[PDB]
Design a protein around this ligand. Structure first.
Ligand SMILES: Cc1cc2nc3c(=O)[nH]c(=O)nc-3n(C[C@H](O)[C@H](O)[C@H](O)COP(=O)(O)OP(=O)(O)OC[C@H]3O[C@@H](n4cnc5c(N)ncnc54)[C@H](O)[C@@H]3O)c2cc1C
Ligand SMILES: NC(=O)c1ccc[n+]([C@@H]2O[C@H](COP(=O)([O-])OP(=O)(O)OC[C@H]3O[C@@H](n4cnc5c(N)ncnc54)[C@H](OP(=O)(O)O)[C@@H]3O)[C@@H](O)[C@H]2O)c1
Length: 455
């Protein structure tokens, strides 16, 4: 009986466990997670107004209910148990811990109150325990978001959606409250390159264009030479550039021009600007604006880069959301790590120079890609592992698995959360939502969570 374990319970951990159980009839798989509950970014990242994306949880639940799979919540690898200890107890270990940081802006004024990263803002409305006291100040009337990817569109969208539409979703009661009292009425999404280089996709661009109660603000002159610099383009991108182009140079209708007429809120895209400094309010207590540098594009195809002209533009606002990407961090200094790419160095999932040690997901390929991309790349890691198994390259001797790790957890006084234990937490979340008609009301205090379980 082979013993294997995974580090992290988001999509890379679970899709890696499903492949192993299906193609090896006796292997046992244990999954370790630092949060008390499973699923990663499917629960704490995907927006609450996107319930259909979260349906992969059903396939995860089936994997976890199998008799050769076990879950161990509330365990922080590299702190409560080290990577070397798991390497000694199992025949193989799979690092799937994602990317827990945000890329920093690194400019004068970033520390001023009213400045936040998108990732801290998303964790706030999604119920991630460490951000439950974020208390963003929504009493200003303008918000500026830096960077143009799908993450930037999701915070602009929760900021501008009429609060009643968010009513029946799983958003936090506390975040819902605060959005009801917000004065934010204008949102700007600022990029350093031009339209041709945006990072978001079409389903997401189109929901923004149609968001009830709002209107779009695109400038006609940023869009010159578009419809020509896109002759040779492939279906995907060209379609996207024509939705942006339509929306920015074509006359609405009698109805659509009137929807735009009575809308209390507005959102716009800005091009050729780069974050230079956050401006302080007269007495310094908060943020009052952002000073952007003017830029010009030099280079060809993908590979184009933005260069500065020497000019500047000051933009007033009371809320700055930094959305220029996430980033992985080293977990345990015994583990290799490349600080330039933000990944664990590897060759098709094999950690460089570390027999028995593998990787899956964002920590294996970088912090980009959707759930389906994470899924199939995880299937690849699992194939390489099972072939290394069958050919005899893993420890050819009996290994204890959880019998040994559980003895250490006990001694250090760490209480692991099992899947049946999650089934209970899950049920309490469901009944707590029953009165307000939400699918659930998320539990946010770890201490209370442990209490509801009997400790
Ligand atoms: C805001 C946002 C919205 C997104 N929306 C979509 C969408 O709508 N559609 C889509 O298809 N994709 C979306 N994605 C992308 C999707 O989230 C990723 O493709 C996917 O979750 C990456 O999976 P992962 O397993 O690598 O990592 P993650 O999901 O991050 O999971 C890593 C897991 O490891 C745990 N962990 C971390 N450190 C440790 C440690 N030391 N010990 C133990 N456990 C640890 C984390 O707590 C977590 O549970 C979104 C991403 C973000 C950020
Ligand atoms: N529905 C979905 O499928 C979905 C939904 C949400 C999230 N996700 C995914 O999850 C992943 C993470 O996304 P993400 O939005 O945070 O990142 P992303 O997609 O890579 O976009 C990052 C942005 O920040 C910019 N940038 C980088 N450094 C900058 C700097 N120092 N100053 C200014 N701008 C800077 C980039 O501009 P530049 O282009 O010039 O460099 C780019 O606009 C993506 O793969 C996203 O697609 C998917």
């Amino acid at each position: 009986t082979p013993q294997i374990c995974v580090v992290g319970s988001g999509p890379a951990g679970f899709y890696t466990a499903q492949h192993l159980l299906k193609h090896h009839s006796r292997a046992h798989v244990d999954i370790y997670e630092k949060q008390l509950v499973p699923f990663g970014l499917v629960r704490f990242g995907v927006a609450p107004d996107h319930p259909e994306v979260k349906n992969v949880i059903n396939t995860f639940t089936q994997t976890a209910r199998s008799d050769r799979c076990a879950f161990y919540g509330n365990v922080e690898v590299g702190r409560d148990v080290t990577v070397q200890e798991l390497q000694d107890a199992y025949h193989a270990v799979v690092l799937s811990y994602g990317a827990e940081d945000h890329q920093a802006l690194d400019i004068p004024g970033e520390e001023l109150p009213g400045v936040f990263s998108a990732r801290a803002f998303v964790g706030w409305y999604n119920g991630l325990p460490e951000n439950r006291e974020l208390a963003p100040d929504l009493s200003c009337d303008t918000a500026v978001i830096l960077g143009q990817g799908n993450v930037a569109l999701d915070v602009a969208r929760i900021l501008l959606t009429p609060p009643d539409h968010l009513e029946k979703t799983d958003i936090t009661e506390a975040a819902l409250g605060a959005l009801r009292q917000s004065r934010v009425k204008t949102v700007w999404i600022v990029g350093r390159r031009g339209p041709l280089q945006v990072a978001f996709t079409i389903k997401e661009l189109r929901e923004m264009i149609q968001l009830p109660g709002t209107r779009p603000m695109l400038d006609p002159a940023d869009f010159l030479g578009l419809q020509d610099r896109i002759k040779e383009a492939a279906r995907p991108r060209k379609r996207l550039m024509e939705l942006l182009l339509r929306t920015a140079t074509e006359k609405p209708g009698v109805e659509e021009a009137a929807r735009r007429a009575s809308a209390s809120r507005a959102w716009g895209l800005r091009f050729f600007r780069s974050p230079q400094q956050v401006l302080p309010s007269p007495d310094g207590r908060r943020a009052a604006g952002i000073r952007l540098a003017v830029t010009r594009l030099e280079g060809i195809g993908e590979a184009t880069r933005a260069v500065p002209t020497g000019d500047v533009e000051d933009l007033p606002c009371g809320l700055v959301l930094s959305s220029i990407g996430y980033k992985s961090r080293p977990i345990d200094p015994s583990v290799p790590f490349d600080p330039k790419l933000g990944v664990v160095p590897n060759m098709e999932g094999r950690v460089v120079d570390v027999p028995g040690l593998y990787c899956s997901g964002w920590v294996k390929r970088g912090p980009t890609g959707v759930i389906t991309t994470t899924m199939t790349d995880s299937f690849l890691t699992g194939q390489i592992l099972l072939q290394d198994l069958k050919a005899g390259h893993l420890p050819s001797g009996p290994r204890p698995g959880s019998a040994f790790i559980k003895a250490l957890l006990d001694s250090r006084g760490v209480w692991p959360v099992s899947f049946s234990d999650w089934e209970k937490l899950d049920a309490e979340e469901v009944s707590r939502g029953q009165a307000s008609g939400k699918p659930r009301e998320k539990l946010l205090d770890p201490q209370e969570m442990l209490r509801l379980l009997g400790h």
